[PDB]
Design an enzyme around this catalytic site. Structure first.
Site: not given
Ligand SMILES: Cc1ncc(COP(=O)(O)O)c(C=O)c1O
Lengths: 350, 121
Positions: A332, A304, A284-285, A205, A43, A235-237, A165
């Site tokens: 992301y 915007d 988001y972050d 993470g 994802k 579950e890395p990303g 996580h």
């Protein structure tokens, strides 16, 4: 290296991705995590190339939706490398996973349990626990964990392991070592409630840029040799794909703002990629992207209020038509027609 | 006006379009209500003042059974003011669920408020 192919196209926002950086980082992984089997959180970046190399090496895949197990099943990856680990799982998704050989499905509440029970009752459940800032709470607490472990039996469903996580922004390793500790306790109550547990998933993470890994991985290795010595997946990303990508944005508008009291020239550049397009991070972050070339503020295509890539940075004049660059735009930053965009990626495999 | 009620839910209604007041009598939790509104397939949940009461997502997750299963919604949108003060943490958390931020102007959505859209499969 690939930090030139940009220029080779300079003559409409586009990516270039060092597809080797993906590999060296995987190499770096199993050299730092020899015990842990990485499962790519697709994802993070569902680009086929990113997956196809990763699959071809030896990484599993943490999928979170129907289309995602599609992408990964189509690449001929055996369903023994797939773990369905969506926090909140829809029913039809449970079913599709069932009808397609995927077995490992997470859970952290009784609400998720009932769903699994009537859609895929013969699944291999992995109890996601809550490592110790977000709105709702994710993962079970050490108490509710037990109640889930019993309920699973009182439902006759096989729980085969636990997961956690810590996610991004973990500013202290002593959080990782703690989860693995709690992960032991849960393994017990499971073995005690009567479960042949064997799977510890430590989620993901770990950082993907150099702004550290081995630091986090080095407090882990003694903690696993401790609580869990003789299976461990992750579950890395952000790790894998961050430093691989570099976004190229084109200035599509220019304005000068003065602010005179009683003497302050300032520039504003609008580009063709925004915070609702690629830069989800900054709302988001709360990211802090620094722009590269070849006082101002960079804004996005949508006029915007908070389509503001960078709010204030010292930068020479332009005009319009110029490109600017952002490194480590691989995690992301890619997704679609809700919700539409689709940019173009240039993979450079040396 | 007695729309729907099962073991975990109690949704009474407010008036066209159809506004829904879905409320979770969860298996052990406090009371969590979500003022939503269903308009042409898609349902639009409004997000409370924050911080969120300790029950959700176990409540909100139930709020996705129904409506996927009873309202047969293809789209569920959430919205909160912008503002707020935890817009980040909010944007971030709901993203962990199959959500994503919606670019203003979309045909399915005012400017003072920030939206997010989750589509079913
Ligand atoms: C269960 C799970 N695994 C993995 C990830 C992604 O991991 P990373 O923070 O490395 O991108 C997510 C979201 O953060 C997740 O919810």
């Amino acid at each position: 290296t690939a930090k030139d192919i940009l220029d080779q196209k300079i003559n409409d926002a586009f990516y270039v991705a060092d597809l080797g950086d993906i590999l060296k980082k995987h190499l770096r992984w199993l050299k730092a995590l020899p015990r842990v089997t990485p499962f790519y959180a697709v994802k993070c970046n569902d680009s086929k190339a990113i997956v196809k190399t990763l699959a071809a090496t030896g990484t599993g895949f943490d999928c979170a939706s129907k289309t995602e197990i599609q992408l990964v099943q189509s690449l001929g990856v055996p369903p023994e490398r797939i773990i369905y680990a969506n926090p909140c799982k829809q029913v039809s998704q449970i079913k599709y996973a069932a009808n397609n050989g995927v077995q490992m499905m997470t859970f952290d509440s009784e609400v998720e349990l009932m769903k699994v029970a009537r859609a895929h009752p013969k699944a291999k459940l992995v109890l996601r626990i809550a490592t110790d800032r977000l709105s709702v709470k994710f993962g079970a607490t050490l108490r509710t964990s037990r109640l889930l472990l019993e309920r699973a039996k009182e439902l006759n469903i096989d729980v085969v392991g636990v997961s956690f996580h810590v996610g991004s922004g973990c500013t202290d390793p002593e959080t990782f070592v703690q989860a693995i500790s709690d992960a032991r306790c849960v393994f017990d109550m499971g073995a005690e409630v009567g479960f042949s547990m064997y799977l510890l998933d430590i989620g993901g993470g770990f950082p993907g840029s150099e702004d550290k890994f081995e630091e986090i991985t080095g407090v882990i290795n003694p903690a696993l040799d401790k609580y869990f010595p003789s299976r461990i997946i992750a579950e890395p990303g952000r790790y894998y794909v961050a430093s691989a990508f570099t976004l190229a944005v084109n200035i599509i508008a220019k304005k000068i703002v003065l602010k005179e009291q009683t003497s302050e020239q300032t520039f504003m550049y609008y580009v063709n990629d925004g915070v609702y397009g690629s830069f989800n991070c900054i709302l988001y972050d709360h990211a802090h992207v620094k722009p590269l070339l070849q006082s101002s503020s960079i804004w996005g295509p949508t006029c915007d209020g908070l389509d503001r890539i960078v709010e204030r940075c010292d930068l020479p004049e332009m005009h319009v038509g110029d490109w600017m660059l952002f490194e480590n735009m691989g995690a992301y930053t890619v997704a679609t027609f809700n919700g539409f965009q689709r940019p173009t990626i240039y993979y450079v495999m040396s | 006006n007695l729309f729907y009620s099962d073991d975990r839910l109690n949704v009474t209604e407010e008036d066209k379009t159809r506004i829904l007041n879905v409320q979770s009598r969860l298996t052990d939790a406090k009371r969590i209500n979500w003022r939503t509104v269903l308009s042409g397939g898609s349902l639009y949940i409004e997000i409370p003042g924050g911080a969120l009461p300790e029950g959700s997502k176990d409540s909100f997750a139930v709020l996705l059974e129904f409506a996927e299963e009873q309202l047969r919604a293809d789209h569920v949108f959430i919205c909160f003011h912008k503002n707020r003060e935890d817009r980040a943490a909010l944007l971030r958390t709901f993203s962990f669920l199959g959500f994503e931020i919606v670019r203003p102007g979309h045909p399915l959505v005012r400017p003072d408020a920030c939206f997010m859209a989750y589509t079913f499969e």
